[PDB]
Amino acid sequence: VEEVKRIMDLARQKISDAMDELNMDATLKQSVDESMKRAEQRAYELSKTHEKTDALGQASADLARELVARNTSEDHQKQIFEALKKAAEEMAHRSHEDRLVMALILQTYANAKVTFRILNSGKALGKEDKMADRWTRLSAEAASLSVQAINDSTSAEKMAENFRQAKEDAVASLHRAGQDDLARKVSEFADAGLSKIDELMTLTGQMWAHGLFSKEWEDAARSLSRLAAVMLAQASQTKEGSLRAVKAMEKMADNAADEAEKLMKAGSENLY
């Protein structure tokens, strides 16, 4: 419970540093300082009742759904995304403190990018009436998985066991849902070391948007998240691998948001 506070304080000070370096709006800055004060207090509140990884995941999820806020201009939200991306980029320049923290901003940045596009798509399309709230809980599960994957980075057999488990699970899940081709591409991606992490993160994001909008793709999206989280835990052990992880997480966030927009403007009209 005590190690969570150091993670939240360090990551928070890094987004504060990125905010000051970027010449941001003073009101926008201190509003976000209070917004992650909320995540600081919530990190301590949810522990000892929920597990530590679950508390960190919901802290990041509420932090991102917070970072969208209520009435914020598009440039300010883009600037929040820029501050998170730059803070992760500079967190790639370093301890076990750095790797777990950098994943936490990346999970929050990925969560915040997709939530903002879900909410903004309804305003243009006239469908402001709801899917973003579930995505917060789904990414709360996802953020704890990525935290746990980097929590496993101290070992070397837990790494191989988790990697083989997640590769088998992702291939089996896509086979089980009738996607034989995609299952074989996921096997190839998992077979190519870290050289195919960009395409795997693109596919992971697109399936995150599809498992959000339809429950029949949920297990495939979760299994792809497990495989991707293991891979990113392998990447962040080094310096440029942390940088490649930052770029790959950006890839996942952008593709998940693009597929979320495409799915919102396609016939999501049910029937009474």
Numbering used by the authors: 4 to 97, 100 to 134, 138 to 280
Paper quotes:
Here we introduce Chroma, a generative model for proteins and protein complexes that can directly sample novel protein structures and sequences, and that can be conditioned to steer the generative process towards desired properties and functions. Given backbones from this diffusion process, the Chroma design network then generates sequence and side-chain conformations that are conditioned on the sampled backbone to yield a joint generative model for the sequences and structure of a protein complex. We sought to characterize the space of possible proteins parameterized by Chroma by generating a large number of unconditional samples of proteins and protein complexes (100,000 single-chain proteins and 20,000 complexes across two versions of the models, v.0 and v.1). The experimental characterization of 310 proteins shows that sampling from Chroma results in proteins that are highly expressed, fold and have favourable biophysical properties.
